[PDB]
Design a protein around this ligand. Structure first.
Ligand SMILES: [Mg+2]
Ligand SMILES: [Mg+2]
Ligand SMILES: [Mg+2]
Ligand SMILES: [Mg+2]
Ligand SMILES: [Mg+2]
Ligand SMILES: [Mg+2]
Ligand SMILES: [Mg+2]
Ligand SMILES: [Mg+2]
Ligand SMILES: [Mg+2]
Ligand SMILES: [Mg+2]
Ligand SMILES: [Mg+2]
Ligand SMILES: [Mg+2]
Ligand SMILES: [Mg+2]
Ligand SMILES: [Mg+2]
Ligand SMILES: [Mg+2]
Ligand SMILES: [Mg+2]
Ligand SMILES: [Mg+2]
Ligand SMILES: [Mg+2]
Ligand SMILES: [Mg+2]
Ligand SMILES: [Mg+2]
Ligand SMILES: [Mg+2]
Ligand SMILES: [Mg+2]
Ligand SMILES: [Mg+2]
Ligand SMILES: [Mg+2]
Ligand SMILES: [Mg+2]
Ligand SMILES: [Mg+2]
Ligand SMILES: [Mg+2]
Ligand SMILES: [Mg+2]
Ligand SMILES: [Mg+2]
Ligand SMILES: [Mg+2]
Ligand SMILES: [Mg+2]
Ligand SMILES: [Mg+2]
Ligand SMILES: [Mg+2]
Ligand SMILES: [Mg+2]
Ligand SMILES: [Mg+2]
Ligand SMILES: [Mg+2]
Ligand SMILES: [Mg+2]
Ligand SMILES: [Mg+2]
Ligand SMILES: [Mg+2]
Ligand SMILES: [Mg+2]
Ligand SMILES: [Mg+2]
Ligand SMILES: [Mg+2]
Ligand SMILES: [Zn+2]
Lengths: 52, 86, 59, 50, 134, 135, 122, 158
RNA sequence: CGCGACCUCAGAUCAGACGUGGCGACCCGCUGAAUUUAAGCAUAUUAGUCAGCGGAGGAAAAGAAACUAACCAGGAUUCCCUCAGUAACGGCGAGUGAACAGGGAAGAGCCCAGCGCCGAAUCCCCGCCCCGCGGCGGGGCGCGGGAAAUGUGGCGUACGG
RNA sequence: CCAUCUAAGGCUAAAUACCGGCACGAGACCGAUAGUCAACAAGUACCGUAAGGGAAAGUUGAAAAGAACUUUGAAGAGAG
RNA sequence: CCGGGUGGAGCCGCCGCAGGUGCAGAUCUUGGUGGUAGUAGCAAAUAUUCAAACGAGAACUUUGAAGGCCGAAGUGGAGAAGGGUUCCAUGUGAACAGCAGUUGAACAUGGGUCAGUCGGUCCUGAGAGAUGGGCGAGCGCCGUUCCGAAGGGACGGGCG
RNA sequence: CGACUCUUAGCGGUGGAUCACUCGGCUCGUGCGUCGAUGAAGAACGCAGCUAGCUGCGAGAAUUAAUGUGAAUUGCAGGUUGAUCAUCGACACUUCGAACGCACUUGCGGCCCCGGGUUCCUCCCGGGGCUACGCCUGUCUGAGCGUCGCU
């Protein structure tokens, strides 16, 4: 049927929690290399380029 | 006697081709079509047979006026004008 | 001739008289089992139907 | 029968003309998948309704 | 990436639209690139092909530097026939083999007045783009 | 009333539906008069109707019909709601006065069963299941 | 020579019929050739003469109906084939004067109280 | 059959509910269409505020809510009469009018009267003929500093 | 007797228009079951559902209170969330089952009859001229014809006039 | 006592609905015994007096280049 | 999992997610194939034989001869209904005609049905069925002279 | 040994599974929201050089005109001042069907006009325009021991 529950609501505190945890993990070099991004020559992992 | 021998007497005809729907369902003694109900002004249709409804409906035939209606609608039934000549 | 199905014997007579410049004696019509109507047009005795058919193009 | 309605005769005329085989030049068309006429009616086998 | 919500990217829709295209859309699909010299002459990269363009086959078995005129633009099987691009049957009669115009380089056009009008229109729109970019 | 037109008074079911004789029609005889007048003069729109007399066997109603293609009605700005195609056969949809009195329409606590536009609309809106995306 | 519609419009009625029945008699001769086993050069011309007949008859009917509706342009009652063929519902609709017709009371109301243009400072 | 300790349930699924099931897969489509209709309305009434006319302060009835005030349907005719506004020009300069509403107390009457006099103080009225200003119309400085207001016009607070 | 009004009722291939029939997903008006559940079954339930009939539109219906309320009161209709599986109905069994208040989406109101006053001030149609003429409309002239005083139009409608 | 409306006449957009139609777009769907009955000359062939019932059936190859010529046989069918 | 072969264009490992997720059965559904089995059978209505022809080929086609049967309530000559080109001529022998076939009602090419007097057409029969009227929520139904202003016709006279 | 039978492998048949493809569905969503007495929906019969079906079309019949386009169509023939395609606003649109002169047989009419015929005087034949029900406004002819008035 079409009226299978396709959609799942997540609590807002948990959605912000997961954004916080994923951001926090995107600053540790082991976890992003274990994700497989080739970063073995980037000069700093929270890689902030200036606003130009 | 009620089977093979009694099938031999089948030489009359209950129905004929209808002048409205074209099917061989025009009952001759009743003078009425058993598919479209010809002497009645309204077409015989029933909601208990949707397959029979979709066998002869507006999609099924030639649409020789309505496919032109559907085309003239897209320019809003513009009439009395031509394209600009050479 | 093969004629139109709606055409009468009178119409077949006047059509042949106008088209091929002749005068006919009688017209027989039948409708062939393919649906086309066929007309046997008998010409008047002063005309020669072989010469008329040669002028039409059939021989 | 030999006694016939004009409408019955014209119906028989159409169903006579539809009972011929396919011409062979159809067979060499580009997007052809048509090989023989599957709408052939034999008078002894199938009986036209009517 | 396509952003237009009226242009479909559906594979079966694109294939149906390609294989059931009418002949004046087929003419645009049956388009061949011009040569390098014809590109620098007319500022036109691609052109629909006609019954008299002198072309080169560059992909296939009949590729090479030989030049032949198109003799027939067979739009229904999406192919063209070129002069010496042929093969022999069993009985010794030569037949023309179909070549897609995307594998075809035009070295000499049939320049009609319609063709010159199309060439000027394509060159002008290309230059409008080039002078819009700066 | 409306005698139930079953052959020989036999309604083949449970005894709650065995009623034949003392049943009543949901619309009034005045609205029956309007629909007979409209279905005869289908080229005219039923406006209203009223009672003019009765005896034991008949009721008599005068129905006001209107011709929407006459130029007086077609060119009076105060009367041209009936010229519009939505007012075809008002008497058959119950949009006249004696037609709307039978539908249970009205305002307030006596007419909670026609919230929406009808018994149809109320029953549809209440006997539905709103299955949301996120529940 | 080919028969085009462009060179047919400048002609008159009797010469259009003279072209037409010439096409009809050569079509009849082409059908005679068709049943007498004639050549493909003549069996190809059956379509050519048929569409030429179609062209001449189309020119005749187009010119004739243009002349009739030039005659009927200023009349209160024109024939039903000359009336505009919209849908039946749009022919049943009100006309533009009648949809622009307003009650004198309501006209007094929009003259007295027009919808003003305003803005609200926050 | 029931098992051990549990609730007695009455699910209302004894009808043919599956014909009349209303899924909400067109919910973001309805939201996106309602949004575009809202911006089309706001673009059409270009200096007039987007939410609509000004609505009065009403006390909710029926003791659960009678401490809370909210926006009513329209200013009542005696509120417009005390504010000195004609009941037909009110809807033309953007005031909601409720003929049906009575007053029973002085203070809600006076609060909505002061709301009307606070709204006419903020009302920047464009002249009816654009190249000719008239007697009560706003001046060309507030015409050039007119903006379209968002949200309810002077929103109601507790 | 005869002529003429009026009323009522005919006839016409009289002049001009309009309806029929189709589609029918959604909508309106009627009509309307039984399978089923109650571990049987008859009220109930299924269900104002299917089938049947009529009528539409691009939406329909509804709609500006003979309303809700009992409050410090709200304010057309429609729709969503909640009210609420609640008040209530029910072999008070099986089961059925709203409404108001509240938050929103939207948001818009108005018109007659009647009562009154204005020399019927009102409407329709044919003739001529000019314009516009493919939504048959505008201006003027007709000692042109009807309708209408058994009441048309202008003002005016409960918020009062 | 009080409160609230003013029935038995009429019109009215928007929010609302939309498994028919016209034109689209999409998919954690199905992949020819699946997905619509119907990927194909499908509401077709065929059946029933009738109301009605109702299929099977995609794929050479890149390109027909679809096997000229020789030979056996009446040929189908072979061998080259 | 790898090796070999065939095939000719896509596929899989790991972390999670989702399910129309695993077959021996349901007298399961659809399709295909066995044993039975070269078996049962090609036995109702007396009957075929000789020579020749054509043909690659003859128990069966054709011709001749012979012997027979139907025996005028026919195994004859013709129509109704029904069938619809089966009728006719030529060609073919792939498929069908339960052996064969050089033959056919098969297949493919072309042909063929001519009316004032023969029938329909016209009449009314048993009946069917509108309008009027009545009934009916309604599509409509009853009704057929019945709660009808049901005649549009004609000769003569006058007038243009 | 052999024949027959059984098992396994190789090769070959029978059969069409599997896999890989996919101009098709299914579901969801957006915009528009339009049939008909000016004859719809539907049906019948015809129309191509070779054409049965499908499709397109209507005696102008696999299409006419106009516009856009700009050299094909193609299975085989044949024959740029615009081939073919698309658009489609011009024109046309057989018979039936609400179906409409009466009937449903392709039967029978009636009125008006035109052409042959005639020598309009009828006939006869051909062609064109009308002839259905209900209903609205208006017109004319009328009906009534309906109500009056006048003489
Ligand atoms: Mg009988
Ligand atoms: Mg119906
Ligand atoms: Mg038989
Ligand atoms: Mg009821
Ligand atoms: Mg409405
Ligand atoms: Mg009441
Ligand atoms: Mg247990
Ligand atoms: Mg808003
Ligand atoms: Mg008339
Ligand atoms: Mg039980
Ligand atoms: Mg039980
Ligand atoms: Mg029981
Ligand atoms: Mg119930
Ligand atoms: Mg129903
Ligand atoms: Mg209708
Ligand atoms: Mg509509
Ligand atoms: Mg309403
Ligand atoms: Mg409310
Ligand atoms: Mg709760
Ligand atoms: Mg209930
Ligand atoms: Mg509420
Ligand atoms: Mg008055
Ligand atoms: Mg007034
Ligand atoms: Mg009021
Ligand atoms: Mg009132
Ligand atoms: Mg009211
Ligand atoms: Mg398959
Ligand atoms: Mg497969
Ligand atoms: Mg399938
Ligand atoms: Mg295969
Ligand atoms: Mg491949
Ligand atoms: Mg799955
Ligand atoms: Mg198995
Ligand atoms: Mg044996
Ligand atoms: Mg055999
Ligand atoms: Mg024979
Ligand atoms: Mg004789
Ligand atoms: Mg009857
Ligand atoms: Mg396979
Ligand atoms: Mg053209
Ligand atoms: Mg062109
Ligand atoms: Mg008869
Ligand atoms: Zn029928």
């Amino acid at each position: 049927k079409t009226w299978r529950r396709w959609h799942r609501r997540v609590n807002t505190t948990q959605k912000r929690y997961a954004i916080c945890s994923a951001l926090a993990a995107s600053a540790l070099p082991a976890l992003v290399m274990s994700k497989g991004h080739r970063i073995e020559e980037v000069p700093e992992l929270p890689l902030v380029v200036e606003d130009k | 006697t009620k089977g093979t021998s009694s099938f031999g007497k089948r030489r009359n005809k209950t129905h004929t081709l209808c002048r409205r729907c074209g099917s061989k369902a025009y009952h001759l003694q009743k003078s009425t079509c058993g598919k479209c109900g010809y002497p009645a002004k309204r077409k015989r249709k029933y909601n208990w047979s949707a397959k029979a409804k979709r066998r002869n409906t507006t999609g099924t035939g030639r649409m020789r006026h309505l496919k032109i209606v559907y085309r003239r609608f897209r320019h809003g039934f513009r009439e009395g004008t031509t394209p600009k000549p050479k | 001739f093969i004629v139109d199905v709606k055409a009468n014997k009178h119409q077949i007579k006047q059509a042949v008289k106008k088209l091929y410049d002749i005068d006919v004696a009688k017209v027989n019509t039948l409708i062939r089992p393919d649906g086309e109507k066929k007309a046997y047009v008998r010409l008047a005795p002063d005309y020669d139907a072989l010469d008329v058919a040669n002028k039409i193009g059939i021989i | 029968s030999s006694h016939k309605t004009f409408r019955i005769k014209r119906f028989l005329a159409k169903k006579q003309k539809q009972n011929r085989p396919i011409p062979q030049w159809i067979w060499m068309k580009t997007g052809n998948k048509i090989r023989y006429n599957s709408k052939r009616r034999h008078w002894r086998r199938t009986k036209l309704g009517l | 990436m396509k952003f237009n919500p009226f242009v479909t990217s559906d594979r079966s829709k694109n294939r149906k639209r390609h294989f059931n295209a009418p002949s004046h859309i087929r003419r645009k699909i049956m388009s061949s690139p011009l040569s390098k010299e014809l590109r620098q002459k007319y500022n036109v990269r691609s052109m629909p092909i006609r019954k008299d363009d002198e072309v080169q086959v560059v992909r296939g078995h009949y590729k090479g530097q030989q030049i032949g005129k198109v003799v027939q633009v067979y739009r229904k099987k999406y192919v063209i026939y070129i002069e010496r691009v042929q093969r022999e049957k069993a009985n010794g009669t030569t037949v023309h083999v179909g070549i897609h115009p995307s594998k075809v380089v035009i070295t000499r056009l049939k320049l009609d007045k319609d063709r010159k009008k199309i060439l000027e229109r394509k060159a002008k729109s290309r230059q409008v783009g080039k002078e819009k970019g700066k | 009333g409306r005698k139930r037109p079953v052959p020989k008074g036999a309604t083949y079911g449970k005894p709650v539906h065995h009623g034949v004789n003392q049943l009543k029609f949901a619309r009034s005889l005045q609205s029956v008069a309007e629909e007979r007048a409209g279905r005869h003069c289908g080229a005219l729109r039923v406006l209203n109707s009223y009672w003019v007399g009765e005896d034991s066997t008949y009721k008599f109603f005068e129905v006001i019909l209107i011709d929407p293609f006459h130029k007086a009605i077609r060119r009076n700005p105060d009367t041209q709601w009936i010229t519009k195609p939505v007012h075809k056969h008002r008497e058959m949809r119950g949009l006249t006065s004696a037609g709307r009195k039978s539908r249970g329409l009205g305002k307030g606590h006596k007419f909670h069963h026609t919230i929406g536009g009808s018994r149809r609309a109320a029953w549809r809106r209440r006997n539905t299941l709103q299955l949301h995306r996120y529940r | 020579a080919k028969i085009k519609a462009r060179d047919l419009r400048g002609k008159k009625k009797e010469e259009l019929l003279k072209q037409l029945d010439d096409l009809k008699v050569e079509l009849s001769q082409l059908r005679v050739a068709k049943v007498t086993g004639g050549a493909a050069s003549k069996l190809s011309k059956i379509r050519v003469v048929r569409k030429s007949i179609a062209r001449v008859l189309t020119v005749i009917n187009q010119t004739q109906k243009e002349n009739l509706r030039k005659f009927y342009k200023g009349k209160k009652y024109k024939p039903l084939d000359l009336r505009p063929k919209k849908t039946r519902a749009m022919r049943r609709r009100l006309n533009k004067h009648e949809e622009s017709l307003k009650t004198k009371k309501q006209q007094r109301k929009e003259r007295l109280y027009p919808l003003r243009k305003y803005a609200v400072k926050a | 059959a029931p098992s051990r300790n549990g609730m007695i349930l009455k699910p209302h699924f004894h009808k043919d509910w599956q014909r009349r099931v209303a899924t909400w897969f067109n919910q973001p489509a309805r939201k996106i269409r309602r949004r575009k209709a809202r911006q089309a309305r706001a673009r059409r009434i270009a200096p007039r505020p987007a939410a609509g006319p000004i609505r009065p302060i009403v006390r909710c009835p029926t003791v659960r809510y009678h401490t809370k005030v909210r926006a009513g349907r329209g200013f009542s005719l005696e509120e417009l009469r005390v504010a000195g506004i004609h009941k037909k020009v009110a809807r033309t300069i953007g005031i909601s009018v409720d003929p049906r509403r009575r007053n029973k107390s002085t203070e809600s009457l006076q609060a909505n009267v002061q709301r009307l006099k606070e709204y006419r103080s903020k009302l920047v009225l464009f002249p009816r003929k654009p190249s000719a200003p008239k007697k009560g119309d706003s001046s060309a400085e507030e015409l050039k500093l007119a903006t379209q207001l968002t949200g309810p016009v002077m929103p109601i607070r507790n």
